[PDB]
Amino acid sequence: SNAASAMAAESALQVVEKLQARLAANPDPKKLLKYLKKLSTLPITVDILAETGVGKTVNSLRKHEHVGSFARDLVAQWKKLVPVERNAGS
């Protein structure tokens, strides 16, 4: 059954978390892009972004020229999930 599955029970949350751990321990810029692509192919929700804090991590990864191009788009895809205000002075 999908519920109480004895195998492949890994929630998107759990997979993102374990990848984010590998992002902080960054072994290669080559592997960093592979990691980002995995965060992007999971159903990311605002709940995951909040618990993992992965938004902070990937926004920081934008500093690397090697993976910053994809990391930018990664934050851009996540910006669609979170609410966005347009408060300004006048």
- For the chain, the structural domain boundaries read 1-90
Measure the CA–CA gap between 55 and 3, rounded to whole angstroms: 28
Q: In whole angstroms, what separates CA 41 from the centre of its chain? A: 9
Backbone angles phi, psi at 65, to 5 degrees: -60, -35
Whether 28 and 48 have beta carbons less than 8 Å apart is answered as no
Experimental determination technique: NMR
- Residues 6 or more apart in contact with residue 81 via CB below 8 angstroms: 44, 45, 46, 49
- Residues 6 or more apart in contact with residue 48 via CB below 8 angstroms: 12, 13, 16, 54
